[PDB]
Design a protein around this ligand. Sequence first.
Ligand code: ZPE
Ligand code: FE2
Ligand code: NA
Length: 626
Amino acid sequence: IPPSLPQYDNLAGKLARRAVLTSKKLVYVWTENFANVKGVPMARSVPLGELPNVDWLLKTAGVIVELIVNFVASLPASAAAQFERIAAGLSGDLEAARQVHEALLEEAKNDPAAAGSLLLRFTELQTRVIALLTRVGLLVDDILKSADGLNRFRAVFGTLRLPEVADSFRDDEAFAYWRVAGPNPLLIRRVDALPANFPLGEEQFRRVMGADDSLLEAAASRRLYLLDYAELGKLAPSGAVDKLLTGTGFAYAPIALFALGKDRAGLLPVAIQCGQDPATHPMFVRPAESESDLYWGWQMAKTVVQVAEENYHEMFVHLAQTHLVSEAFCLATQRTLAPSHPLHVLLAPHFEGTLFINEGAARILLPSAGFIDVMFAAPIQDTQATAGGNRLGFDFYRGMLPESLKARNVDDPAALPDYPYRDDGLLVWNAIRQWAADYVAVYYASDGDVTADVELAAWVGEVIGSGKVAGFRPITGRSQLVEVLTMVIFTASAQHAAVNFPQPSMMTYAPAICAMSAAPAPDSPSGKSEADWLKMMPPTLVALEKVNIYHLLGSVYHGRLGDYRQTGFPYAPVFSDRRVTASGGPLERFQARLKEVEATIRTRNQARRKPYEYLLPSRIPASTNI
Ligand SMILES: CCCCCC/C=C\CCCCCCCCCC(=O)OC[C@H](COP(=O)(O)OCCN)OC(=O)CCC/C=C/CCCCCCCC
Ligand SMILES: [Fe+2]
Ligand code: NA
């Protein structure tokens, strides 16, 4: 039976669907008092049907067990004894659980008619792998209870290969390239006049870029780009923050200027101010290779920027603006769009695992003494409130990719050619938009169908009200609905992938990036030494948690954008409506467009300085689930 808008449903349908929604509202419940994320709309609890499926669980547990094995194997024999039996047990039990799944799948194939009798056993296996994860939790607690000068930062990897950044992190061009191809491609903006509190002069600029260049000429020819971390607020504490587990830590809200050469061959760092106030933060100017008395001050200044970057990327770009936005849309959808509504059918796959993983963020990562309290310099209460505040301030329309690019004046490939996130992101954004347009056109023939849809009206009301999604507004027509759906889907799939999956290759090595420093910002551009820079490096506990959590979060690829097939047993099609699924129809056209996009990105990557692969559709999950 094809999905329908409520106004066109037969009365049998209208009462069935309305009672189903009444039932949903008792199961999916809003709260703004969820532990460790106060003020952010969350599910009060994760319903049984929102627990992760066995496929996700086996994949996630597999990575976690690899990490445990790797950690135990890195220890000396005396220390390993405490954990070897427990690790061998988890490993063996995971393998047994894989075999139960494989036997169940073979059993279902041998008699599909009788496959309905297996559902309690599939849920039993779900319960079992979750219980295995609870045992991991206890083991992690025990490990933490027993917790060139950079050897310790290689040691925490065990036998995992160090990422490429471990070799290249001191390079100026690599540092600049993070701004357009790194985990946070959203902050960089064109600058036309410098902020008043960033007093970089013409002479300093020419010192770096040459006597025949100038600030005026660079600005006017669209060659100046600024990173300004002012929005970090309390994520950049005033001074020292002392904590039990990690001792004394610092973080920062710096300002950095980047410039293209006249040939636009690549972005270069020009100057860094390590805080917002120039009276207390001197200007650091990119040194020449011969200026050994400026070298270490500059390394320290870049490290200040990278400290700011992990804070901004992880709390705002990753947690606040993907995970915590998709939380609200998941809830609104389940509470207000009936399962027989075509938009429920379309959107539900894009929220698979979202409630579960976000509850995990709040319960595991955000409490006092948890991962974020260790890895991020600010007091945990400030981290929670600042990340929460960023989620509440995030404007849904202004946050749309095209709008973001235009507002930052980075949307013109002629002015800023090497910006992989922009170029690949637009291909994916536009493919999703055409899909949303085709799908909306099946079910909505007029703007009247949009405004007379009482469920959609209620959905918008919940997104604005209980969901606290800033910038969201009444939906009065088909074009607008298409833009909204494009943003919801892109946010859940591609945006998350772009900022989540760089974690293993770019964020696992603490000297290249860390959300806390063990020393204040460099007090002077000149006279610094390697020892002064090493003092910024965090304690080893920070590095240990970092390598493991960031490897995990970027190693689970579950589901795929455009596949629209269940990701757990029985793996059935998401759509039944032949108007959607027909040969050459909307879904097939979307799937085909995604393959063209993939081919285009692969061609672009042959010509790029380094491949950018995070927005390859084959590497984009449909939902935010890790
Ligand atoms: C950090 C910034 C991220 C921001 C974005 C957050 C977005 C959402 C991501 C949320 C992710 C939530 C955390 C992952 C969720 C994994 C799926 C899951 O739900 O797992 C549940 C288990 C058990 O939970 P429970 O409450 O019983 O006990 C926790 C400890 N008190 O949690 C873990 O395995 C610990 C994982 C920590 C990582 C261990 C890595 C291997 C360690 C082995 C080597 C030991 C080294 C210490
Ligand atoms: Fe994530
Ligand atoms: Na299909």
